[PDB]
Amino acid sequence: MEGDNCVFDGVIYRNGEKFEPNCQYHCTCRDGQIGCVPRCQLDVLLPGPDCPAPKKVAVPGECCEKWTCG
Protein backbone atom coordinates (compact mmCIF):
# COMPACT_ATOMS: atom_id res chain seq x y z
CA MET A 1 0.00 0.00 0.00
CA GLU A 2 0.99 3.64 -0.50
CA GLY A 3 2.85 5.24 2.41
CA ASP A 4 3.70 1.95 4.14
CA ASN A 5 6.89 1.59 6.17
CA CYS A 6 9.42 -1.21 5.54
CA VAL A 7 11.19 -3.76 7.73
CA PHE A 8 14.76 -4.74 6.93
CA ASP A 9 16.91 -7.04 9.08
CA GLY A 10 14.68 -6.38 12.08
CA VAL A 11 14.66 -2.58 11.76
CA ILE A 12 11.64 -0.54 10.71
CA TYR A 13 12.36 2.09 8.08
CA ARG A 14 9.79 4.73 7.26
CA ASN A 15 8.42 5.39 3.79
CA GLY A 16 10.91 7.54 1.94
CA GLU A 17 13.61 6.83 4.57
CA LYS A 18 17.17 6.00 3.43
CA PHE A 19 19.79 3.85 5.14
CA GLU A 20 23.04 1.97 4.63
CA PRO A 21 23.15 -1.67 5.77
CA ASN A 22 26.90 -1.55 5.02
CA CYS A 23 29.31 0.86 3.30
CA GLN A 24 28.72 -0.84 -0.06
CA TYR A 25 24.98 -0.13 -0.47
CA HIS A 26 22.47 2.73 -0.22
CA CYS A 27 18.85 1.69 0.38
CA THR A 28 15.49 3.45 0.25
CA CYS A 29 12.15 2.34 1.66
CA ARG A 30 9.33 3.07 -0.83
CA ASP A 31 5.76 2.16 0.15
CA GLY A 32 6.73 -1.02 1.98
CA GLN A 33 9.46 -2.19 -0.41
CA ILE A 34 13.23 -1.67 -0.02
CA GLY A 35 15.41 -0.93 -3.03
CA CYS A 36 19.19 -0.47 -2.87
CA VAL A 37 21.96 0.76 -5.16
CA PRO A 38 25.65 -0.20 -5.04
CA ARG A 39 28.14 2.44 -4.02
CA CYS A 40 31.13 0.53 -5.44
CA GLN A 41 32.08 0.09 -9.10
CA LEU A 42 30.87 -3.37 -10.09
CA ASP A 43 33.26 -3.31 -13.03
CA VAL A 44 34.86 -6.11 -15.02
CA LEU A 45 38.51 -6.95 -15.67
CA LEU A 46 39.44 -9.69 -18.15
CA PRO A 47 42.57 -11.88 -18.07
CA GLY A 48 45.57 -9.94 -19.26
CA PRO A 49 49.04 -10.85 -20.50
CA ASP A 50 50.59 -10.42 -17.03
CA CYS A 51 47.28 -10.89 -15.17
CA PRO A 52 45.81 -14.28 -16.08
CA ALA A 53 43.45 -14.55 -13.11
CA PRO A 54 42.10 -11.12 -12.15
CA LYS A 55 40.33 -11.28 -8.80
CA LYS A 56 38.70 -8.59 -6.66
CA VAL A 57 39.86 -8.69 -3.03
CA ALA A 58 39.22 -6.64 0.10
CA VAL A 59 41.87 -3.98 0.76
CA PRO A 60 42.89 -2.53 4.17
CA GLY A 61 40.97 0.60 5.12
CA GLU A 62 38.81 0.59 1.97
CA CYS A 63 35.11 -0.04 1.63
CA CYS A 64 35.24 -1.49 -1.88
CA GLU A 65 37.17 -4.46 -3.21
CA LYS A 66 40.03 -3.78 -5.61
CA TRP A 67 41.50 -5.71 -8.52
CA THR A 68 44.53 -7.97 -8.06
CA CYS A 69 46.41 -10.44 -10.24
CA GLY A 70 46.24 -13.91 -8.69
> Quick one: which of 31, 35, 33, 29 has its CA closest to 3?
31
**Method of elucidation:** X-ray
Residue 60 is part of which domain span? 41-70
Provide the domain count of the chain.
2
> Quick one: which of 27, 25, 26, 22 has its CA closest to 14?
27
What does the alpha-carbon distance between residue 3 and residue 40 come to, in Å, rounded to a whole number? 30
Resolution, angstroms, 1 dp: 2.1
Domain assignment present for residue 22? The answer is yes
Domain assignment present for residue 65? The answer is yes
Whether 46 and 31 share a structural domain: no
Q: Which CATH number do you get for residue 15?
A: 2.10.70
Contact 16, 44 (CB under 8 A): no
3-state helix, strand, coil in the chain (%, to 5): 0, 45, 55
